[PDB]
Each structure stands twice: as structure tokens, then as C-alpha cells.
Symmetry: D2
Subunit: 143 residues, 4 copies
Amino acid sequence: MSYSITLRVYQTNRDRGYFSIVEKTVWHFANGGTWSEANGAHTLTMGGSGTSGMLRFMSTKGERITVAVGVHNYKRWCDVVTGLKPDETALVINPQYYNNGGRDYVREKQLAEYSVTSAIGTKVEVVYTVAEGNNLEANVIFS
Amino acid sequence: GHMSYSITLRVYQTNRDRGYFSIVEKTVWHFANGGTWSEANGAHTLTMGGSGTSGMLRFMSTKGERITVAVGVHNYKRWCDVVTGLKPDETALVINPQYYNNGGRDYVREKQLAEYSVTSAIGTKVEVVYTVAEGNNLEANVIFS
Amino acid sequence: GHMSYSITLRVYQTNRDRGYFSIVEKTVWHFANGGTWSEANGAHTLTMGGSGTSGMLRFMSTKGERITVAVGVHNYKRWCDVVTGLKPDETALVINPQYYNNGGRDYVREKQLAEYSVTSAIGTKVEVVYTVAEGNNLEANVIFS
Amino acid sequence: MSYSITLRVYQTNRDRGYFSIVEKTVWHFANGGTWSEANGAHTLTMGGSGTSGMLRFMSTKGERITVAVGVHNYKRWCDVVTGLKPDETALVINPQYYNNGGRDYVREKQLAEYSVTSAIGTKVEVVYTVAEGNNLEANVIFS
């Protein structure tokens, strides 16, 4: 069966910079997948369990952050990476979750929520609001 | 510092028989300090940190046809390529690296083409044509027919 | 309650000589409990609270040409119209009401057209063609050429 | 001289519903104007001083709200109207600021900020971050 993850973005802090998506990737396991946009939300559709995709964001102050979401052994997972250099594109980071690329262990945690504060003080949270089944939903919150 | 390059793409869809294409993935290669995609006035701009990198848009139609368009700058001149007939697992993340490190598509990048045309096995024609083909603020049309 | 109607529009731009059109305004008329525009998969959907209302997209090209497309449902059947040659102050807010209350364009609404074609004075052709022309979930192509 | 107003939307409350734009209008004085979208912001460009435009938003919980922005006698103005019925479209509300339509006095205040809490508890703020000149900028904040 196919899986989808639908993300809505909440930006809450008017002092730390405004974020926009600068890249969207899909990993090639499980027959791949695609991003789409509807009603102000972003949906990743995947061919089955065992793959993922990523949104990279950049702020008006030049801060670069990636959000990864996917399904591992039929359960959702997520991660956020901050403090990225300009050349650390999503194309670089998304593969790091597979083939013992350094971040596999995070995917294997199957997290339904994750939060981190960047070194320059930006907090990012991913929280699944629908955390079971094939039509998953999560909020991405910048603060 | 290094000179930055931007490529701005506008999409023309002309043939209802091909179904309707939408973007399903946007990648940026990591050479030359990377880069970012942005959207404005219905156009898509890839901004890059220097000559020697690229990015890709993958499209999928309402009929399930998957096609990638790659654009970049090689030795200070624009390049482009179109790949059709893609399998569901042949994502832009798979294809974009193939232009580098002798990955199978370096040759077309090295041609520094200002236009590219191909017809897919199922009859969809795709053209990339640069309308501003020189300098640091490049512009091209992507045409489905 | 009342039956709702939706109209989903996809835009095809085919001729680079016309410049490139983008949406500059989106309106909804207030009869039949109003309605809303939404965007998904690169298509534009007008959802309405009943038969007897409409909405409009106004487009402007990179060459400054302004054109409106109106779609709605009249007596349970779809309708459409295209107005070209618009002055800068002839916004969709001015034009959408003209289809009602004997405002000058009621006649075309009452025709319940499933297709419309016009060529502007400066040579831009615009077509609206419904591909799903019956029922409550209607679909049309808007074609610039 | 032409005027522009660029708006960025901040949604901060994950419990009260997610908003999206459902209508965008431009008033016909001062040679009219146009909306555009870039970098996740919304820009209203106007032919001169003396006109305005509006964004209408609807939440996932069915709440309908309009935000009006414009320039009156060379100074920015704004307003927010909440508790709207489905048939109170932007096409209905935008004209109410002119021709003694009931809301002219709000436009004439030339506000650089405005906030209101709807009857069902949603707070909306418009705050100009660039409040002078021809290239104005404001945040629209839902909370």
C-alpha cells in the first residue's frame, strides 16, 4: 500500500527570519514518491513503506534547515538538521539516513515528534497530528 | 568572491493529450557552494553559488509520466538536459548526481547547450530553450507538447 | 441543503510571443452562499455554495496584457466568459458584478456555455473549454495562444 | 508614483485552525493594481496612492476573515474584518471602505498596525515593518 505524509508550516517568530522552501527531495527506495502542494500544505506520496523525502528551508537571514519525513517498517519517522552550509543541500542530506550514512539510527527511532534549537537560536518542531495509518499528517513549527 | 549565477524557468504546456504536468521534486547539486530554488510571478529560479553546479525539476503528469529538466552552468556557460521515461524510483535525487563524477550524463553538461529537445517513447515532446543565454541572470522556457 | 458546485481550472500557455500570464486577482460573487478559491496540483478550484454564482481569475502577462476569465453555474449548468482589452483600473472586482443585476454581461452567463473563445485586439487568443461539462464537479482548461 | 505592499503570513496557533487565502481583490481607484506571489510573500502593486486590495482567508475550521491594505493620501492603511458569513466575499467587503460604504473612517485612520480578536477567539494582527515610502511591508499574524 502507498503512504502519504501531509505537512503544514507554522512560522511564529517575527524576529528570527522568515522561512521558505528551497529544495524538495524524494529517496528512491519503495518505488520512490512525489511532492505535491494543496490548500497551503505539502504532501509527500510514497510507493510503500521504506522511503522518505525532505524539505530544505532557508530564512531571510540565511539560516538553512532540513526537515525529513518518511515511513520505516510501517511507522512514521522524522528528523530536523540545522546549521547547514550553503553546499549541504537536501540532495546531500537525504541519503545520509540510509546505507549507514550517519543518520540511519534517527530514522530507526520512528519518531512521531522531534524538536531541536539551532546554534543561532531557532527552534524547529515536527509533530505528527495523525501518527498512524497510511495518510499521516504533521505540523512543522518554527519559533 | 565568486560570481553567482541564476537560471529562471517558465513552463509552457501546450497539448491537453499529454495530460497536465506539475513539479514533484526540486534538487540542487552541491558543487560551487550549492544553491536554492525560489518561486515568483509563476517562474522558478535556481540561484547558484558559482559556475559549476546545477539543479533539477522533476515533473509528473496527470497521466503518470515522469520527466526531469536539469539546468546549470559549466565553465561559465549555461547547460540543460531533459530525461524522459523515468521509473517511479528514478527520483531527481538519483538523476542529478549522474551529471558529475563520470556518472553517465557528464557529456551533455559539457556540451553547454542553450537549447534541448526530446520526444519521450510515449510521444511527449519536451523543449528547453534559453531566451537569455549569456551572462549571470539566465532565462529559459520549458515547453511540453 | 443546497447542492454545491465546484469548477477546477488548469492553465495552458502555448505561445511565447504573448508573454507569460500569471494570476493577479481572484474573486467570488456573493449569490448562492458565496464560495472560495483553492489551489492544488497546479489547478485552481472554485467551490460555490449553490447554483447561481461564479468567480473570476484576472491574469496579466509579462507584456502587460490584462484578461479575465469568469466561470460559474447558472440554472444548474456551467457557464464561462473571457474579457480582454482591460484597462489597469478594470479589476475583477469591477468586472465580476457586471454578469448580474442587468450589469451588461448577464446575457453570456445565461447562455450556459461549455466553451468560449476570443482573440484580443492585440492578437492573444484565449479559450475556455470544459472537459467535464456536466454534474457538480466541473473541469475546464484555460488556453492562451 | 506606484505603491506596493508586501505581506508575509505568520500562523502561530496549532489548535484554532490553519488558514489559507481564498480570494484576492483590488479596488479600482488610482489606476487599479495587481497581486503577485514571490518567496512566500504576497505583494499588492498599485498605480498610485488612493486604492487598496484585500486577501480573504478561510481556516480548516471554516472561519472567514479579510485583511485590507492600501494607501490613502500617501500613507499606508490596514483593517481586519472577522466573523464573516460565506456570502460576505472580498468582492462585498473591499468596496465598503469607499463611497461612504461604512468603513471609510477606518481607511482614513491610516493605521500602521491593527489587531482584533474574533468572536470565536482568533486573534489577527497586521503590523507594518516598513511603514513609510512606496515599498511598504507588513506581517499578518494569526494567533
